[PDB]
Each structure stands twice: as C-alpha cells, then as structure tokens.
C-alpha cells in the first residue's frame, strides 16, 4: 500500500453508457473506456481492424507502429459479453488512468460488431474485474496497479450521476484507491463476495413495495458496472413486470408516464439492510404526459453458469448507491448518491 | 518569500463564468470579481456611473464616500478586452482577497456597455497578469501582495470545475503561493513562456482527431482564466469547425445535439504533452435531439498584434487542466485536474 | 333568492384536471379542489392522515385544532369513486368558496390511496350532486349556500378551457348562483333530468359522422364535472373506437397523430339538439406528425347501478359546452364556447 | 367632491405589463402608459430623444411643436426605477385620462436606455404615487384630479386579469375615483399605510406552504402596480426560493416545469388576512417537461431606504387580489378579484 | 427542341409531401400541386365542388367564370390513386408552369374525400406519366409542352430535399427540359424503361446488407415522384422488415431509435448498378433515443395488374437519387444527391 | 454607356441579411456590406468609433491611417432607418465593388449602436437609391459608375436565394449593368416609378386568399433590398394578420407551427400582374409543434411622409421575384426567380 488515489471523470450518455478516458503509447493515445466489473480484461480496437466493420471506421484506433514502448505479443483472444462480441490479440504497453502510468497487457481488437458496438460511445473496455474470468489469463489492469505499492488502499469506487439538460455536470467518477465522499453521504455498509473471483453477492429477497414477492429463499446478485440496467431473469422479470402493472410494448416494457410515481419501491435485500429504489430511480420519466409512454431502467437478461443465474445491479443501482468495490476484504461496500 | 497560501472560492455560472469575492474599503464594500491572466487591471463598478448605464443598475458599485481608507487618485483609464469595453479613473483603497489584505489602485468604472456587462454575473475583474500589460502602469494586486513578502511560493493557481446543480459542489478555487494537490493528480508538465510580461507558451501544433491538420509550423497560446472558451483566429477555428462538422452562427459554431457526443478529440501540443479535450469537454451536450442545435466552447477571437496572432486557452481549457502560474521561473504548469 | 353571484376561477392541469381555491376554518386553510357535480360530498385530507399514505405527504392536511370555528361531529364516512376510493370521518366548519361564507358539514379523510390521489394536483373534493346521493345524507353544498338566499337564482355553471403553453390564460371557472356570458355564446338550450337527485339527461342517439350507430332507442348522460373524460360502456366505446378507425394501443385508444382530422364529428343528440364535437375537440393533438400516435379524450368505464349503465359527459364535453346546472327547474344548460 | 368616475381599460402583455392609453396635447397624441403605484411622476418618450436611443425609434414620441396647448418648462429631469433610468425635462399639457382631462407637467424622455425599453410596449408612465416621492416637487396626476373635486371619492381600484389569446378578453382596468364591483367579489379589507406618502403598509409575515418561515417578526411591503412580480430583499427571496427548490440564473429563478404545478402556496400577512397564492398564480407553467425550465414571477429586488428594504407586491399578487387605492383614508382594501 | 428550361421550386411537408406552385387561366389562379410521374392527368378543385366534403372548403378552388381564356368541355371522369380517389369534369385553360404557359385540358374535380385530401397540403396533381395511361386519353401536360418545340431536350428532372427545422431551404425542384447540376454530382447512369407508357424499370434484385435476399429473379420498379414511400408488395415488406428487426407497431413498422444506425444498407438493383440507401436514408430519425421507437420511410402497397405487382421508388429513393425522366430515350437517369 | 457587367457574390445569412464585399483604401479594406435600394449613402464602421460601442469591437472598422489614397472631409452625417441610427462623418476613398473601382464619398460611423448592430453579420451599407434622398447630398456610388460610362445598362438586378445549409449554394448575387437570366426565367414585367427620386411604385391591391381585403384603392410598394421582411402600415398588417389568424408579440407576429403551411396566399397587385407568395414562402417554418410558435416575414413598419405610408417589399418578396431596377427608364421589372 501507498498514499495516493487515482480517479478518473465519465461521461454519462443518456444514462445507459458511462465511460472515461485512459492513454495508451508513449505518447499516449487516448481512448473512451466503460470500467466494468463484469469483465477482466482491457481491450481497444486496433489500427489493424479492418474497415469492412462499420464499427471500426466509428472508432479511435491503437496504432501500435506510432509507441516507443509497445511490445509485441500476438497470442489471439475472444471476449464476448452478454449483448455482444469481440476479437482480435494480445499487445503490451503503457496505459495512464488518471496519471497512474501501469505497463498492461491488453486486447487489440481486430473483429468488431455493428451490433451492438456501432451504438457504443466508448472505444474500448477496462475490465476491473478478477484474474479468475479474464481471458487468456492475463493479468488484470486493477491487480497490476495494486502491485505498484502506490494505493492508499486496495479498492476502487464508482459514482454514476444522473443525467440533465440543464447541466454540464459530471457524467460520473471512479475512485482507484479510495472513495470520494463528495458523491455519497453517510458511511459505508458492506456486503462479503460469495467467493472472490467474481463481484457477485447474496442477495436475500427483493420486495415491491409491502410483499417480497421474489428472491424469497435467496438469488444473486452480480454488481456489474459495465451494465446499463438492474437486470433479473426472464421469469423473475416478467413477475416483476406484472406486479409493477407494466407491459411489454414490442421491444421494451412500458408504463403511461402520469402512471410512474404511482409505482411502488422496490428493495433488494443485500447484507442485512434494504436497498430502496422509487419509481422516480428505475423509470425514465422522459415525460409526465397522461399522453405518453415511459420506459422503465431494467430489463431481462439469463446470465448463464457457471455466473448465472443472477441478478445484475448496472447503473440503474449505481445511480442510486455509490459503490466501493473492495479487493482487499473481498466486499462490496454501497453508500447512498449524491 | 514567507509561508503563506491563501485560497479563494469561486462561484461557476453556466460553465462559462467564475468568479470569486473580494472586499475593497473600511468597511469592506464586497464584490464579485473574475480573476484574470489575460489582463493586469483590477476594476470594479463606481457609484459615479451614470444609472443610464443598465449594467450600474444590476451590479454592485463602490462608493468611496463610505470608505475611511480611500485615497483619490483620479486618472483616467479605458480597459479593453476583446469582447467589450470598460472606462472609469484609478482610485486607491484596502483589498482583501483570501485574507490577504493589499492597498491597491484600481478601476473605478463609470461606463459600463449594456453588452457584455448585463450578461456578468460578476461585477468586476481583478487583473492575475504581468505589469508590462497594465494599463497606466498600475503596480498588478499580485505584484503588491509579492512584496509583502508572506507567499511560500512566488505562484497562484487555478482550478475550475464542472457546472453542478448541486449546493455542495465546489465551482472553482485560486490558490496564491502555491498549488491544491487535492483538484490534480499525476505531475505538473511545465512550459516556459514566451517572455516574461504575457501568460503566453508556444504551442507545438494543434489536432483534431487523428491528424495534426492546424499550427503545424508552431503557434502561440494564451493561458486565459478571464476567457470563457479556447479561442483560434478566424482560419484556424473556420478550419477546425470544418473538421467537426459545425455551422456558423452570429456568435458561436453549433453542430447538430445528436452529433456531439461522437465528434472528434481535439489535442494541444504544449512543451512536449499533448492536452486532449474529448466532445464532453468542448460540447455544451443539452438535448440529444438532431431537431436542435448545440453550442460549442470554441470560438473566432482574432487578437492584434503584439500579443495576437494568438490562441488563448481559457476556462474549456482549464476545467480539464489544474493550473499554475509560475512568476518566479516565468513558466505555466499543468496537471489533470480532480 | 338574492342578488349575488361567487366565481371560482379554475387550474387546468394538462385537460384532465380541474380545481380551484376553497378555504376551510377561522382562519381559513386553503385546499385545491375539484367540484363535481357526479359526488354530493365535500372532503379534503386531514392532520390525522397516517403518513404511510405517500398521499397524504403530498397534500395539504385539514387541521382542526388551528381552527376557532371547527365543531367535532367523528361519525365515519367511505366515498368511493370509479377511479378511487377515500375514508375518514365529518366534520363541521366554515367554507369560503369565492367570498362566500357558509358552514358545512364534510369529511376529514384519513385513508387516501396512492392510486390515484398520487396523481392528484388537488387536494379534495367539493360535491356539487344531489343530497339524495350523500353519503350519511349530509346536506350538500350548495343546498346550504341555497338556504341562506342570497344566490341570484338557484343555478351553478361551469366554464372548462383548453390547456396552452403560449398562456397563463384561466384554466376555467365555476359561477354560483348564475352563467358568464364572457365563456359563452348565444343563448342556453336546456334539457330536462331524468329524475332529481342525480345530475343525468336521457340522450336520444350518438353519430359518428353521418349515421347514429350508437345509442339507437336511447341511453343515458350523466353530466359529470368531476371526470376528464367523455365516457360510454365497454362495448359503447369499442364500437366508436372501431367505426373512427382508433384502437387500443396497450393503455389507451391511438389514432396517428397526422390522422387526427379526418375523423369524423361525434355528435350527442341531447334535447332535441345536437352537440358536436369535431375530432380536434376529442384527440388530444400532441402533435400532427405522420411519425407519432395520439392519444383521444374518450375512453370506456361501465358505471353500476342505479346511476349505470351510462355515458359520462365530462371535462372533454364540457370543454366545447359551457354547461349551467339549474337546481330550481331540475335541467341542464348547453352553450358553445368560448 | 363630485359625482364622477372614470375608468380606463388596459392590456395585458404576456402578465408582465399592463397599459393604458392616454392622449397629451392638442390635438391629442395618444401613449400607451404603465399606471404606477411605485412613483410619482408622469413622462413619455419625447421628440427631442436622439434617434441613437433605438428605444425612442420603436416608442411614440411627444412632439411639443405640434401642440396648440403645450407650456415650456424645460427643468431637467432623471427618474430612477429598480431596473432602469430615465431623463429628460419638464414640459406641461392637457392630459385626457379616461375622458378626464388635466393640467399636467410632466416629463419629456431625451435619454432611454434600450435594456430594459426596448422590451416594453408601452411608451411612457403615469406615476400614481403620492407628491411626496415626486422627482422635482412636481404635482402629480392624481393630486390634479382631485383638485378638479368631479371625483366621487379620493380613491382609484386596479383590476390586472390573467393573459388570453382571445381578443374579447379584458386585460385589466383602472377606475378613478372608485372600484368596479365586477371585478371583485367578497368585502375589501383594509390596511392603512405605514404613513402617508408611499403606497406601502405594514406586512405581518410570509408563510410558503405550512410554516411561517419568513417575514417572522414584521415587514414592509409596497403594492405596486407599476412592477410585474411580487419582489423581497435577496437574503429573503434565496430562503423562499430554497423552500421552493428554485434555482437562481441570472434575472429569474426556475424550477423543472413538472415540478411546478405541485409547488407550494405562498401567504402574505396583510393586516389580519392571509392572501395566498398557489403554484398556479406564480408560476408560468409553459410546459410540464422535466427537461424545461419554468420562471417564477417572484424575484429579487433590494430596494434601498428610505422605502427599502421591502417586499413589494406587483402584478403576480394583484391579479388575484383586486386593489382599492385609498387617498382620503391612508389604506390599501384587498378583495378577491374575478 | 428549343434551348429553354423551365424550373418549378417544391415544398417539401414533412418528407411526405412536395408540391409547388402552378397557375390556372387569365389572370392565372394559383395552386399547389404534386409533380406526379405515376399519373398522367392534371386536375385541380372547382368551385363547384359542394361544399358538403370538408377537403374542398379546406383547397383553393379554381373558378371557371373568373377566366378570359377558359373553355368548356364538361366530359367527366374519375381519378383514382392508390390511396384515394376524385372525381369531376374535363376543362381547357391556360397553365403556367414555371413561366412556361401551355393550353391545357385538366380536370375541375368536385368530389373530393376528406379520406385522404384532408391530409394533402397541395392543391391538386400534374401529371406526369405518359399518355398510354391518361383517363379520358387527355393529352398530359408534358406532351403538350413537348409540342411547344421550346424545351431544350425532352426530359424533366427531379430534386426531392430532406427536411430540416434549422433552414428555410428550398424542399425540392423540378426542371421541365434538363437538369440542376447543383443538385446532383457526377454524371448520370440510366436505365431503359420496360415498355413505354408507364416508367416503371426492371429491377434484378434487392439486398439487405450482406445478401440479395429478395427480388432474386427478377420484378418491377416504377419510379414514382407521387409516392412518398419506396413500396413494395405486403410480402416482399414483411420479409424486409423482418430482415432488419423492425415489427408493426399498430399501424407502421418501427424500430428503436437508437437502433437505427445499426440497420443495414438497402441496396435496389437496376441496370447493372447498386443503388444503396443507409439507414439514415430510410429511418425517420426522429431522435435517437434508446426510449423511443421511430418508423421507417418504407412500407407495404400491393399495385394490382397492369401495372403491379410491383416496387415503387417514391420520395424516399429521390432524395438519395436525383432522377431524370428522359421520354426521348424512355429511361430514367439517376446520380446521387445533393 | 460601354460593354460592362459586375457581379458580386451575397451571402445569406438566415434569410434575413444579405450581403457581400467591397474593398476600401489602398491597400483595400474589405467590409460585408448589405446592398440597400431604400436608401443612398454608403457607410462602414470607423476605427474612430469608440469601443463603447460594442458594435463596433464587433464588426470591421476602417482605418484612414493605413491607406494611401483616402482623401479627408469629416462633414458630420447621421442616417437614419427605421429600426436604428447611425452617424459619423464623411470621408473619400477608393471603392472596389466586383472589379468596378470607383472613387466615392462614404461615411465613417463612429455612432453604431448594439441594437440593431450586434446582431448585424455585416458591417455597413452600400446604398443603391437616388441622389434625391441622399443624406447630405453625396453622389451615390452607382451615379459614379454610370459616369465612368463602361456598364452596358443603367441597370442593377437582385437574386436573392433561400437559406441553405450547404456551402455550395450562392446566397445571392448582385449584377451591375444588366440581370442575369441564369437566376430567373419567363419574361420580365415592368412598373414605372411613381416618381424618379425613389424605388417606389404603385400597387393596385393586396389580396389574402379569395379576396381583395386591403389596398383596396391602390397604394404604395417600396422595393427595399435592404428590408429582411414585407412591411406595411400598422392598420394594414393588423388587418392582414387577423386574416392569417397571427398573433402580435414585441418585435413580430407568429402562428402556432402547425398552423403555418396550410395559410392562405397573399397576392400583391403590381402593374397588371399578381405576385403571388404561398405560406411556405414567408412563414419561418422551423417545427409542424402546435405547441410551439413561428414568426413570419411580414411586420409592421410606419414608414413617414413624404416616402410614406407605404408597403415595402423587401427580401421576403425578392426571394421569389428576380428584381431589376432600371435607372435608364425609372422602372422596376419582376421576373420569377431560379
């Protein structure tokens, strides 16, 4: 351990993609990354990524030929996420996340989607999750940074803010070695991993308003930074759905915006304590209109093994909780907003 | 050389003002004031302003007929920025800024255009440049708190936030003699000016993207807090709105609200660093409609001779990098600014 | 009889809510109210409201003991209404409506849903129906405001105006004890009760352009100042819906907003006259896009017996109408406008 | 005293200004003018205002040479009002207020400042505040008609109506020497100026919802028909806009338009009456958008002694409460306007 | 041939409608019309059309009797389009063109159905098909301006523009006797029609992306300047939109906007050449919200024989594809843009 | 006369300035300025203006001091048009106007104020009236290009163009000595002058739809390439805006923008033709909201004797009507423009 922390400032897109920058190369080129406690691994598209994908052209890419301090690697890679996939093979070289200069293996991506990565804001993906998920087993970027000696302690935090028009505001903050207490008020409470190698939690019930209508004898519960969404199994969501009284529209489900402050809190039952989104925190009030209709912030997504089934607690959670991520303890610490 | 640092709180309006107070007189008659590297006057508005002038009506103006510690100068000056005009005569008084306490000769103002000055917030300018640039060569208050002999370091610094709809937030901070650790991170990269008399570096080069498209044979940089944007001359910033794609209007280049987010980084090669600015940074993202137009903080400002040909990096600028302004090494230092 | 006329001037809340000021105690506490001629009871919130009902946190509460005029009476009350339903307790104490002073029993309601009070702008209640359907037969009113004598003549009217963003123009307005001809044109038609003590008009025949296809061999119209909506039964109003080609998004019946005028006029045969309204009367125009779907101002609701099965003539009819209720000859007036 | 009252009907502009039309001269030319409680002088734009003043090019322009009745003074004048300053010089001519004609000096306007005059429709004022806040002892309009003794009573009423984009609608009315008792309805109530000389009384506190949280022990409040708000000191506008949660910009405060309809009342202590206002009297709801910004016409205004520091109570208060100006008497009578 | 042109500029409402201006008789009376190369009759409203079809009180009118060089026929006819259908009698007149006058028989229509011509901003049609397909075998108007020998080559050209809220650009233009190179780049590649008589073309397959998944063996093409849509069979569009992920809504196909952008070009094989629309081209971006569904530019019309089945190439392939209509050659030129 | 035509290039700016460049001094100094039929004087911005001025901080300014072949005058001149005043003094130089040089007398203004200046793109006027209403009787710049005798006709012609958001679109363009037949098609159609002096002539009419409701007995049309809109009387716009269905505000008048494509025509009767403009042509069309609202190019302008009352007809009539003004035979001709 050391005395310092690194925090790094996200812009948040329409409260469904948070990212920030980091610099590879010396001299570095800056890249937009999602830090997402999903995954293990860092990756950015390459120079090498050929122009057929619409996604590459749309993208800032590594040119490894233009850094004094890359070094060739070349072992292949497939990263796959539940919404998407992508390609391409190993490179070292220097990353910077907020004046933190860290020599990183990384992915070069080479095979990159329109869907869903045509729609992504952000380049690439620092993956702050364990060496026990990452692909080809390199090491982590986090366990690396942690081998430096420098960080006051051996944790990193998450702030999401919410967005407006009315502001130019901070998109969000991550924390590398601490917490900012600007963005949360009160103290910590903490919950322990089920096993360390995944950021992944009991969770013991989850209630809509006066009922723990799911969860009940216990689920799971993923705390997953680089999703957009609260997210539940297909049937936990459907029963989740229909006790809310919204409904699938085509693609999403929906309730009539005069309707969303009518709809009850929902509790997830973490480590002992209730934590409480209103309707005002899970609906996209776009409007009020007794004339329109809003979309709700969750959705279904079946995880599968050996991680699913679980719940996934993405930025719609974030939002609401601050979130400390700690490697040391193997916890989870929330603290509300701010 | 003593051991004092002395902070002031700055107020953000709209990401495009910061302002911070100081008490001039016995007793103190309080006002708000832009602290200011591209000027070296202090001025604040007199109550010998004709209330014809509107912009009197709607700030606060010093009445030296209250103040014991007044002494009467009376000569004239006119201050002229790029944007405006203002005219008064010097008078000298006790200024306090940050619990420093200075005599001081300033501005009193008694012509005081409708544009710009109805659009401040703040009611005057305390001028943080170099004597070789005052007007009637009045002694800078920076200059007279330096012979006092109690700053640690013969330095001042600046930090400026993000806008926030939140109380709590900080909008900004000067520190005199010395520098906050705790608004940067990573070290300070550091430019000798030019010349001594001028906040002003040479600028390496200028891209947009992936591209050294402008000052690609060296240009020069003004370090500007007083300024709200970064400013090009008119080709320059006519060939860099080409390159993000932005119309022309009255007063400012807008592109298309849906656009922003995906324009390209623009970078600024100062002293061997590059200083990158994403969309976030220089887009003011208030709607994400392709119906509505978006303004950026960028803009034309052709400044003469001997200062000008000049881009001058203001608070677009600044809000991203902590920095400071070294008198003694006749230098300006950057940090990633937290 | 006397020789005074009260006005109460109206807050339209988006078309579909309609209240204004009444005061209640010495001195006065103020409630938003909707007057509604489909209840016989006066209620408002009470002090003794439980805060479990997020309801009642978001409403001004009745407190007694502020009040040198309150008299206890405790006997409970349940009023119901097809929407939602509230309960509590009588009380006495003076009601002012427009500078008019008059003591009246009503109820302080200590049970107060979230569906629908949540979506209340108004507070309360004040029933302008018949004593005959009072819950606890209390006198209702305006049949107290009737016996102190000094009402014009022995009739209510109501002016209900469109909702618009270019206007702080009046939301509409209620007069005791006559009519104002600024909010209408022409002279009154008058059609006669059913029977006293519900505020219901026998109708003769519904067109959907040229052919009545509904309420052939006649039906009824209760004429309802407390509902938003013009409202048939169930299979009343999917017949309309299917002849104007509109159909049930998943909430609410939608036409393409571009769509909108071609439908045809929807005429009421009421009297021996008829009451149209044209389509820009009965959809709600959030836009005439091609792109977008807009909602219509009819919707189904199967009222019980006795009052049911019926057609509700509310705050749409009513918008084209200026309606006077005149309790002495036991009829309904109609005028247009305006 | 005699037997006569005249009234003059006025329009209201967006509920900001509301005017009058009066005729100077002979033969007559005609100006629109602001009935002014809150001064004391009488004064049009004259013909003599350079054409570089671009508010003389947009105003009506008194031109003496082609008056017949016209009488030279020529003693200069300035008139400072809170937003603005005026000057010119004294001329006298027959006035025709309302089919009163009078013997008038008042000024000719040679310097207008175009913010704020160039937003105004109206051309000039009518002060009708009492001789002793008269600007160069000159005597007011109203002190002239008394002097006539054709008037009923030493009393002048002010009706402001709420904004319509109908033409039949009555933007407000000013009856000299009396009330209108249709546009008032209950009983005046009586508060007897602080003193002679200014339309000012004494204020018992200001309550926003259920608390008297200012105003606490005692203040000032001026009924000033010629301000478009209800104003306070700075300090107690940011306490009442904090309740509110309202944020400060530049020249207004704002909520989020969905937020408005469900604000708060404000009560104002007028000699044992409260006069609330709801969400709907002080807020221009021009949108329910979450992402729209809505003013309040409530501002800051520190108006300084000997009248100040006061609240003052404009067009925002007198809209619904009708106002009686009583001069024989030394009193203000509210009644509830329609 | 001649060496003139003649050039009529369009309003472009919506993106569905475009229409400009033709004058009727001496003096000329004005209509707006759609330029319709999928009819070959003119005709506009008559003042003898009853005023019993709302559509006629809401079109201009032209009157016979108000013209000094019309001439009677009377013969009738009926207009029918694919979505609707008029009906009147056959006239002479004068008809100016862009300054181009023609006699010309059209028809004075007097039945008009609210159903579509409620919708329809333009007047009335100008018929550009040829004369095989003419109601009544009258002459088309561009035959007879054929005859004239003025045009400098028998061709006519069409510029469709996107609409934009920002610009009041011109919405299209036609050109009678060439082309507008500004509205166009490159050259033109054309394709021969399959028989003259109608311009329709052979169209030899239609891609989505990476597959030519429909229209393999061949089908038919018309190039309709008076469709607003590209068409094609309810079957072919139904595995189109399945292709691309969109589903009906209630009455249209619609996608989430922000999935817009990942829609795959659409490709229309003809002549040897692949003329490709990208989703941008197709898809009513309304927004781009992740909240929002927006519809497609695309949709399903069954043409029945002689003329279908068949595509149709309507507004939304024209502005992708400036297009010339050559009868000298009978093909039909197209060059992208601009 | 000799063998000459110039033309120069305009720029369009929002549709309501035109303007190109001219050349002043030796070595020139190039100022935008707008082309102006309703007036005779040349001016451009001083460099003796005071930068109190902001307009003038804002715009070009010439500098006698840096050219060779200025000659001195400093006769004062003030001119005045309708929405704002200039004045400064006289001074000679060499005037470049596309490749004509000529030597002229123009004012140097030194009094520019911030309304209507600040909102100007251009810097000063070139205007192109008679001597008759030159201000101090200077030679106008286009009587000294006809002395030179090299321009083929005593003609100059206006093409002004519709906005566009392309680079490659001319804004306008200006011919001296002839018209060009590239941006008008038909014939012309000539009015005389009521009298030489002034670019005026009858108008025999104006109609609204189907009916002649105002210049009923014929009036005055300026042709005013300096004016953005059509102007005419206060009494006459009020009359034409009540048939639009407008509504008045400051500074113009609007109509809900849904409303705004489907107004009537208006026709103006000029020497036995009508000229015909469509809604599209002067309605600002920037949304089809009915919550939102859209300014028109038509106001009211009282323009004084002896040029005045008059219509004038500025650029929203010269958009659609090519113009040339012809000094030779003191006509106005009308062509439709392309």
């Not at 690194?6 to 409260?15: E, H, K």
């Not at 409480?276 to 409007?287: C, G, K």
């Amino acid at each position: 351990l050391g005395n310092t922390t690194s925090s790094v400032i996200l812009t948040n897109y329409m409260d469904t993609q948070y990212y920030g920058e980091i610099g590879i190369g010396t001299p570095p080129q800056t890249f937009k990354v999602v830090f997402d406690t999903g995954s293990s691994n860092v990756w950015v598209p390459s120079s090498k990524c050929s122009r057929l994908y619409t996604a590459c052209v749309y993208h800032k890419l590594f040119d490894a030929s233009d850094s004094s301090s890359y070094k060739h690697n070349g072992t292949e890679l497939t990263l796959r996420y539940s919404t998407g996939t992508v390609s391409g093979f190993l490179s070292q070289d220097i990353i910077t996340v907020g004046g933190i200069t860290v020599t990183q293996m990384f992915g070069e991506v080479t095979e990159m989607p329109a869907l869903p990565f045509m729609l992504a804001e952000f380049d690439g993906v620092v993956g702050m999750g364990f060496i026990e998920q990452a692909i080809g087993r390199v090491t982590p970027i986090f366990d690396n940074i942690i081998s430096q000696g420098v960080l006051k302690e051996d944790v990193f935090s998450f702030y999401y803010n919410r967005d407006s028009e009315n502001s130019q505001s901070l998109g969000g903050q991550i924390v590398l070695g601490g917490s900012d207490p600007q963005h949360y008020e009160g103290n910590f409470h903490y919950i322990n991993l089920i096993k360390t190698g995944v950021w992944q939690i009991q969770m013991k019930g989850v209630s809509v308003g006066s009922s723990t209508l799911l969860c009940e004898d216990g689920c799971l519960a993923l705390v997953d930074t680089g999703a957009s969404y609260i997210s539940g199994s297909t049937s936990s969501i459907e029963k989740l759905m229909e006790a809310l009284g919204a409904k699938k529209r085509l693609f999403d489900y929906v309730v009539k915006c005069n309707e969303g402050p009518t709809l009850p809190d929902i509790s997830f039952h973490l480590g002992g304590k209730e934590y409480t989104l209103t309707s005002a925190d899970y609906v996209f009030q776009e409007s009020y209109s007794s004339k329109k209709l809003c979309t709700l912030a969750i959705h279904a997504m079946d995880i599968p093994p050996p991680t699913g089934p679980t719940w996934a607690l993405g930025a719609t959670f974030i939002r609401k909780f601050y979130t400390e991520f700690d490697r040391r303890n193997n916890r989870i610490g929330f603290a509300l907003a701010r």
